[model samples]
Target: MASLTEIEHLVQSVCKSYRETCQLRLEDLLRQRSNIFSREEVTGYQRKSMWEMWERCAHHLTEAIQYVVEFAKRLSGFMELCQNDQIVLLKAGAMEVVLVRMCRAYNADNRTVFFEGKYGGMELFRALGCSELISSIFDFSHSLSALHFSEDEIALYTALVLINAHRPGLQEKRKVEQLQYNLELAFHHHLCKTHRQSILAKLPPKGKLRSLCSQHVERLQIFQHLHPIVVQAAFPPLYKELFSKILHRLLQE
Candidate 1:
């Protein structure tokens, strides 16, 4: 809760100044090739306790990248439904860390590429944080509809996104399997319970999930159609061209 509060504050601070900038930056990173196995040291994981270490080593994670976007979107939708703003806020914090890391690694100031001066004093970094928060909260945060995604499908995909980021070890593998099982059961419980409105009912979850995943892999893209300027910098021209064509067709559907 305290973590969420801090994240919320940070997001609020950024939103007060720059909104879209932070969102796009985070998306840019999210869209980047998976660095889960990168040699780079992410600060948060280094502080894990002995218990955490054992659990991590036991968990076996799946390395499929498309699930990251799918899971995020479902998580975002669920957070919105739950009105859980804190998680959304923390997403902002995580995004900021990512942006800072990218800028440092590239030796290119984000402000230069993002053009903070031309855009409403919105520092690219800050705006990136803001958008990451919104994207987390409103877009990809919900669980797939019970009717659309089977318990198996959800478990399979969740494992896919989480596996690569995990520090490799037996304990981590076991934990990953256990966690996915628990999640599958929980989602089953959630979907079975009757509700006034189901988010899944609103989406073409089964077909859509398959389509989104395949298209993302084929196009080497993320999110729906994002700005060309941002996407072009991330993907090759051929990839971008495919991305545009595929999405344009999907939009008509």
Candidate 2:
């Protein structure tokens, strides 16, 4: 059993590593994009088409993957998982955690998600041609952002996504559960101390994330259907690699 001291240590480390790896401030990223492109140019890019928006978003997606990997490693017992298990966990959880982390860039008051640059509302992505999927993302972000989670809460949520005890193909369920338990303890402890009233049940929203990700995979296939060349030549290498299952399915078709 993890003692109180160990759980506190876990909370501190989780918070630090998340802050370190998640250095992409919406303020910095949006400002940098603005410096390169004037407002009119940015509007033109958005007006182009869903195909155009897809590539821009895909470009940003790959960068978030690296932060997800770094945060996974920082979780206390993550590296201890067998290497293949590590790969499986990352493959399954990377985008979901990134979605959770996106709460940082989410402007709850404005109901917009920061993409490429700007806290863009849903209309900014109407050109992306998938309001069904886009609305779900915005909805998820709005709900999660409404919670007003703190840095530590977000860190704990990200860590839980990576170290999923119930992820399929896990070779070490018992061990994974043990590690997850410790994280839960730390999570519960933090919530209790902060008086956030988040029950343990609230910690994993994994089902909702799973549905959200599946919808994304569907949109990817839709984009690929209309623009195979872009899927073939323009997608970021890591994005393709992580979503390879979806790609492989496309190949089967």
Candidate 3:
């Protein structure tokens, strides 16, 4: 494999392409499946066609995202090492140092994110967004404070659940728009019923559930800063064949 720096750059490029490709595939897939349903059938049907299928797809997407994000962090570490290298530059020392300094600053800004989903309470928040059925099935997530998760985290999860709750409509677009709207609306209601339904049964009472949700989001927000580095860093190992295939394909481009 190439040096970590090279690998990181490759991963970053691949991830951008992967996201675009996967989303487009999903759009086409949803369109074909959604056309079968009529307006009258929209309200009750599961958007994924079934819960099991949805879970499988969600798991795959989440895994792909997680793999990309991890490598991005590793890239951050490599960039840090490069920054501190006052030693002889492999190429141009001055330019390398400048880039390293920027990464160093960026890394410092996002240290908390290293533990976001890893931490137990925060993991709960991650679950909210990652696994919709489990989140709403439990029912104790209504409270504003309790498990250390963040409100924003809760809102994101709540939004996803609400969006999925609605079935696809005519034009394949109506439901997508509804998904967007319900997801946004989920943040407003004081009770945020969807989250409450998802977690409360197994996790805690309303108050504790709310707090846990907040803590989760608070811890997670750092990833936005760390994303580029981590996702870029991990691409080589996470999708070894895919990486090679992409590189080979890119060469033709």
Candidate 4:
């Protein structure tokens, strides 16, 4: 069994690699640009169309998926999983991982969600028929932000998203389970070590986070499958790419 301290250190090392890989090149694509469209502007030509907004939203979604791909590549033991197992985890966990990152971008006081450097209010998404789901996300983001997780904790949590053994069709279930256990222990250890005295009483509940991730994943799936009357789906292309890479790797094996 790896000691908690060692596992924590290992996870931090992996996180350092995640930060260093694909630096400005990716950021340049993800950085916020001037609003190509907004809900407020209205006229024949002046009206900000939902189609245009959806395209921008899709672009951001793809970038977020790419971010997770790069981040996953840097995680210890991630690539060691068989390709089919890797696909199972990524399919099940990608949106959940994005939600984890999105929480950091939330500002509860202003009730805004920031992506890349730009921010938006719920009203924009409300127009897309995501009012209730977006509200739930805001609530979860507010709670997570209140915890004030350190970079190490956040990184560990991100790894935890992929280390799930419960994801369907994992080829090496025991291996993933063991990895999950080690990361869980290290996550708690880091929290206790950093917060010490208050840790026992105030530690964020893992169950609550898991519940929130589950809820967000369901809502994200629905959002992607929104009726054509409401909006076009943005998740399929990235989902295809994610599966393609996994299957390609599997065939080679």
Candidate 5:
């Protein structure tokens, strides 16, 4: 029943919250960092700065998550869903959308990640000691940015991620199904109005996101065993909880 104009208006509002919630311009990630780290540096210095870098990443990650909560509350149909259903959707979809949002700050042109208020290449991130995780983050963001999605597509795709009907534990399956149907329609109309429908099939990046997130969890476990104190101290409690739960949820599939 929603007209094109109506959908556009709805998208604009959701986008407003998304942009406002996280002040980091992902373009900077593409444009993105400042850094000087060396293997010759003292091992003690490396350990200390690694925690500092971890804290910074954690803070931005918490901000990324805040954007997701804000996006859900602003979506017209999402507010109509039952409260429990709302919880379910966020629990399942939050990180995947975070993955989508991560692309904005990624600059494939330079092959860098936005860090410490500037563009940082992989060598600079080595202080963090999680080479595997950092490289995958770049690779995923690199591949995603290669697709060259605009703001509207990213916004709408993020909406579709959270509005999914297929999330297990959804109380009203059809309600979510219905919500996704409208947003899915909104996506097609926007794409039709912007480009061809081909991008739709390429979108949402299902298996990649899950496995990437799974990789993140695996690395976290490895890191935790090594730095239990820093992991507990640096990350927000909610972030830790979310990742823990997601490991179980992701492996369930």
Candidate 6:
């Protein structure tokens, strides 16, 4: 068995590699895209086409999902699990992972979320029936941003997200559960060593982490309802046109 210090080092090492391999790709892709909404158009409340927005959202969300999948496949921590167990954890945690990473796109101070290069404040999403979800995300993002988690911390938390042993239908529950235990200990070791006296202050209080996860899940649910239209649009090479149908249905409802 590895000592606590050894586990900490391993966790940090894996996290560093994961960021280089996975996170950077997503960030690069996002930066390359232009913002879809013009400042004047958003400020004037002019009804612009939702089709473009839907397409962008779908494309970005799909990329985000792909990032999580790549991480799941590459991370040694995840690779250790049985194939069935691996799929279960990834399926259960993908949304949480996406929402956590989506934090990068959010500017809590401005109340704006940047999807790729396109930007929108809460008011824009509010018109789309996402007022509550946006508010919750902003609040969550604010709290998360305040932590200023180091790269290692973010990576560890992501690992924690992926090693959820309690995910229903695991084939190797005992082994998977042990992996989660090891990760939690490693995370606690890192926090204790780095944060020292301020560790308690830095980490989310009891139940707060759970609440954060719950909020992310809720945000994903909202996205599902809003973006299914975009998914159809970017599908089967008829892409960008199907968004109209979903937007129209959304408007009708």
Candidate 1 matches the true fold with a TM-score of: 0.23
The candidate, 2 or 4, that scores higher on TM-score is: 2
Model 5 clash pairs? Answer: 26-104, 26-105, 28-32, 29-105, 30-105, 30-107, 32-118, 32-119, 33-118, 33-119
Candidate 4: C-alpha lDDT: 0.62
Q: Which prediction has more favorable TM-score, 1 or 2?
A: 2
Give the number of the best model, judged by TM-score: 2
* Candidate 3 lDDT by residue in tens digits, 52-119: 33233334434443333332223222223222121111111111111111111111111211111121
Residues 154-240 of candidate 2 have per-residue lDDT tens digits of 888788888888888999888889988898888889999988865455554668999988988888988888898987898887787
**Candidate 5's residue-wise lDDT over 1-253, tens digit each?**
7777877776676666566655566554443233322345434334567667666667777677766777777776777888778878887788888888878866676676565555546766666788887787788888777678887778777888888898889889988997898887877777888775787676546777778778877877876787799888777776787774432333223
- Output the better candidate (4/5) by TM-score: 5
Q: What are the TM-scores, per candidate, against the unseen true structure?
A: 0.23, 0.87, 0.20, 0.73, 0.80, 0.71
Off by over 4 Å in 6: 22-38, 43-55, 196-253
Tell me the whole-model lDDT of each prediction, alpha carbons only: 0.30, 0.77, 0.30, 0.62, 0.72, 0.61
The CA lDDT at 9 in model 1 is: 43
Worst 10 residues of 5 by lDDT: 29-38
Task: Output the TM-score of candidate 3.
Answer: 0.20
Per-residue lDDT of candidate 4, residues 129-168 (tens digit): 4456667767777877777766566677778876899877
- In model 6, the Cα lDDT at residue 222 comes to 58
Q: Model 2, which residues run further than 4 Å from truth?
A: 25-43, 198-204, 245-253
Among these predictions, the greatest lDDT belongs to 2
Per-candidate clashes come to 39, 0, 39, 0, 10, 3
